[PDB]
Structure 1
Amino acid sequence: AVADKADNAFMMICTALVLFMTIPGIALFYGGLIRGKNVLSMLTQVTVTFALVCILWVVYGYSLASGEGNNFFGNINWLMLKNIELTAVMGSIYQYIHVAFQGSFACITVGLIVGALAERIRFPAVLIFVVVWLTLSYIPIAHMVWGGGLLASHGALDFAGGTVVHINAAIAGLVGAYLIGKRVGFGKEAFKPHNLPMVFTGTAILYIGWFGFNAGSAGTANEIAALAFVNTVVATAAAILGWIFGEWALRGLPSLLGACSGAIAGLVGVTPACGYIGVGGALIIGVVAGLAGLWGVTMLKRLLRVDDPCDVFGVHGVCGIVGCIMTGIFAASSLGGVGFAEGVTMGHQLLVQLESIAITIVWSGVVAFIGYKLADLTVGLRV
C-alpha cells in the first residue's frame, strides 16, 4: 500500500502524545501520590524502565507483538526492525510510525506499574520484572489483541487497550502490591494534600496524551479517530462527574483526588470502547466507570486501609474490566455503536469480552508473579 501523509502526521503526533503520558504524565501522577522521600527513586525507575521498554520494543517486542506468528506471539523476523523497509506501509502509515506508536503503549503500560511500585521495589529488581513481564505478558497480550492473535481471532473488541494496557497492568501492579510489603510511616496514612496538584497535573497530561492513545488507535485521521476523540472527551467528563457525584454522596464533598480519579476512570473505561460506541454510550460508560472506580478504590481501602499509589490499579483494573464489558453492549448499533462483527450477537460479544478479561487477568497475573519471583530470587524484590 501507500502511506497517507495526513495519517503519518496524525500518528506521529499521537505517538508523541502517548509518550507524553509516561514522560512525564504518569511520573507526575504518581509523584503526587507517594512520599517526598521516594519520589526521586520512582522518577528514576520510571525513566529507566521507560528507556528499557523502548529498547526492548525495537529489539524484539514489535516483532513478537505485531509480527505474524501464532495465537500468542508473532515472530522474530523484525528484530531491531530488520527487514522493514523504511517505506514499508502498515495500514495507511509508514510501518516505522506503527512501531513507534505501539511502543508508546508498551511504555505507558509499564509506567503504570512502575510508577506505583517503584518506591517499594529494588532498582535491579524492577528491571528484571519489566523484562520478564514486558516480554511474556505485554507482548503476548498485545499480540493476542492487536497482532491477530487469540483474542482478536475470537472477535474481542478493545479499541485502544482496556485489556492490553489497563487490565494487564492493573493485575501486574496488584500482584506486586500483594507480594511486596510497604511500611507506612506514621502520619503518612493518607495522601498528602500538598502534593495533590502534581497528581492533577499528571492526570491532565495523561488526559491530553490519551487523545493520542485513543484517537491514534484508529490508525488514521478519519471519522473513527474523530469518534474516539469525542468519546474520550465525553467519557472522561462523565466519569469525573460520576465519581464526584458518588463521592459527594458518600463523603459529603467532592475532592481533587476524586475528580482526577474520575477522569482516569472514564479514560480507562472508554479505552476499549471509544472507536466502537456512540457518544451516548460514551457518556454512560463514563458515568458507570467513574462510579465503578470509586467503588473499586473504596474496596481496596477496605483491604489496604491506607492510601497507597497502588490504589491506581483498582481504577485501571475495575474500570478496564467495566469498559471492556460495556463495550460488548454499547458497540451495538441499536445503541449508536458500530457494529458487531458478522454473526455476532450482543450476548456472544459479551462472553467474548469476559473471556478476554479473564485471559488477560490470569496471563498477566501469572507472568507478573513469575517476574516478581525471579527478581526476588536473583536480586531481592523489597527495598
Structure 2
Amino acid sequence: AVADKADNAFMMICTALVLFMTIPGIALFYGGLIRGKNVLSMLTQVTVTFALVCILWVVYGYSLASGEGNNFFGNINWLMLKNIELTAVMGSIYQYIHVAFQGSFACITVGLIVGALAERIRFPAVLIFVVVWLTLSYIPIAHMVWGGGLLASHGALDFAGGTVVHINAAIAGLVGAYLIGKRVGFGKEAFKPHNLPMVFTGTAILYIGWFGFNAGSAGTANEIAALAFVNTVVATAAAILGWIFGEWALRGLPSLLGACSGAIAGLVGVTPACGYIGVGGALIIGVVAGLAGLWGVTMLKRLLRVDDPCDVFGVHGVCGIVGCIMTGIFAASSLGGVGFAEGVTMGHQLLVQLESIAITIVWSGVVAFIGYKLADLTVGLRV
C-alpha cells in the first residue's frame, strides 16, 4: 500500500523507545540487582548479545519471524532484507520500520534473559545460548503470534507480547537459573540498597520505552495506540499500588524495589491486553498483576531463599501469564474491551489464551534447555 508518514514517524520513535528499553533500560535495571563485581560483565554481555540479536534479526530473524511460511516459522526469502524494496509498505509504514520495530522486541526479550543470567554464565556460552534460543524459540513464537502462525491462527490475543516477550523470556531465564548455579557471597543474600537507585532508573527507562513497546504495537498512531498508551499508564500505576499495598500489608511497609517491581508487573500484565481492553480493565489487570507479581517473587524466595536478579523472571512469568489470561476476559465489550473475534466467546478465548501460554512455556523451556546444554557441552555454561 502507501506509507503514512505520521505512522512512519510514530513507529520509528516507538522503535527507538523499545531499543531504549534494552540499551540502557534493562542493563541499568539488572545493574542495580547484581553485585558490583559482576556489573561490568553483565553490561558487556547485554551489549554484545544486543548487537548479536540486531544482526541475527536482519540476517534471518525478520524473514523467519514475519515472512509467510507455516504455523511455526516464516521463510528465508527476506534474508538480509533481500527482496524488500525500501518503499515496500507493511501495514501503514515502510516495511523497513516494521523490521526495526520487531527487531527491538527481540532485543529486549533477550536482554531480559541475559541481564539476569550474565553474571553466572560464560561469555562464549551466552552467545551460543542467544543464537539457539533466539533462532528456535523467539523467532518461532514471534511467528506464531505476530507472523500469522499457530497462535494467531487460533485467535490468541496478545497485543504487545505477553507470550512472545515476557513468558518466553521468563521461562528461558528460569530454566537458566535452574541449570546454572550461583554461589551467593556472604552478606550478599539481599539486594544491596545502595544500588537500588539504579534499579529505579532502569525501571523508569523500561517504563518510558514501554510506551513505544505497547502503543507502537498498534502499528499506527491511531485510537488503538492511544488506548494502549493510556492503558499502559493506568495498568502500571495500578500495579505499583497493588504491589505496594500487598507489600505494606505483608511487610508493614512499602519498599522501592516493591514499587519498581509493581511497575514492571503492571507493564508486563498489560502488555498482551493494552490494545484490547478498556481503562477500567487496565486498572483491574494492573492491580491483579501487581499482587500476582508480589505473590510470584514471594514464592521464588521460598525456592531460592535469597534475592537474585532471576527473581525478575517471576514477575515477567507470573504477570505475563496473568496478563494473557486476563486479556481473554477484559477484551469483552461488556467490560469495555474491543471484542472477541467472530464466533468467539469469553470461555473459548480464555482456553485459547491458556493454550498460547502453555505452548510458549513448553516451547521456550525446551529450546532454552537445548540452548544451555549445547553451550555447556561446547564451551561450558557456568562461570
TM-score band by shorter chain is over 0.9
| 1:142 Cα deviation from its structure 2 partner | 0.1
CA distance in 2, matches of 1:246, 1:303: 20
Is residue 84 of structure 1 aligned with residue 84 of structure 2? yes
Cα deviation code 1:168-207 (max 9, x no counterpart) = 0000000000000000000000000000000000000000
| 1:150 Cα deviation from its structure 2 partner | 0.0
Aligned to 2:180: 180
CA distance in 2, matches of 1:241, 1:197: 19
| 1:103 Cα deviation from its structure 2 partner | 0.0
Cα deviation code 1:84-142 (max 9, x no counterpart) = 00000000000000000000000000000000000000000000000000000000000
| 1:324 Cα deviation from its structure 2 partner | 0.0
| 1:144 Cα deviation from its structure 2 partner | 0.1
| 1:149 Cα deviation from its structure 2 partner | 0.2
CA distance in 1, matches of 2:331, 2:36: 44
SS of residue in 2 equivalent to 1:230:
helix
CA distance in 1, matches of 2:227, 2:8: 19
Aligned to 2:29: 29
CA distance in 1, matches of 2:105, 2:136: 16
TM-score with structure 1 length normalisation? 1.00
| 1:165 Cα deviation from its structure 2 partner | 0.0
Aligned to 2:164: 164
Aligned to 1:236: 236
CA distance in 2, matches of 1:300, 1:204: 24
| 1:290 Cα deviation from its structure 2 partner | 0.1
- Identity of counterpart residues, as a percentage? 100
Pairing of 1:251-330 with structure 2 (within 5 A)? 251-330=251-330
Cα deviation code 1:22-60 (max 9, x no counterpart) = 000000000000000000000000000000000000000
| 1:322 Cα deviation from its structure 2 partner | 0.0
CA distance in 2, matches of 1:239, 1:305: 24
| 1:337 Cα deviation from its structure 2 partner | 0.1
TM-score with structure 2 length normalisation? 1.00
CA distance in 2, matches of 1:255, 1:226: 31
Aligned to 2:11: 11
CA distance in 2, matches of 1:19, 1:284: 28
SS of residue in 2 equivalent to 1:74:
coil
CA distance in 1, matches of 2:343, 2:85: 38
Cα RMSD of the aligned pairs, angstroms, is 0.1
Aligned residues: 383
CA distance in 2, matches of 1:281, 1:78: 39
Moved over 6 A (4+): none
CA distance in 1, matches of 2:75, 2:280: 40
CA distance in 2, matches of 1:71, 1:299: 35
SS of residue in 1 equivalent to 2:340:
coil
Cα deviation code 1:65-101 (max 9, x no counterpart) = 0000000000000000000000000000000000000
CA distance in 2, matches of 1:333, 1:100: 33
Cα deviation code 1:198-232 (max 9, x no counterpart) = 00000000000000000000000000000000000
| 1:358 Cα deviation from its structure 2 partner | 0.0
CA distance in 1, matches of 2:339, 2:225: 16
CA distance in 2, matches of 1:339, 1:60: 35
| 1:264 Cα deviation from its structure 2 partner | 0.0
CA distance in 1, matches of 2:149, 2:69: 8
| 1:151 Cα deviation from its structure 2 partner | 0.1
| 1:331 Cα deviation from its structure 2 partner | 0.1
Is residue 59 of structure 1 aligned with residue 68 of structure 2? no
Q: Unaligned stretches of 5+ in structure 2?
A: none
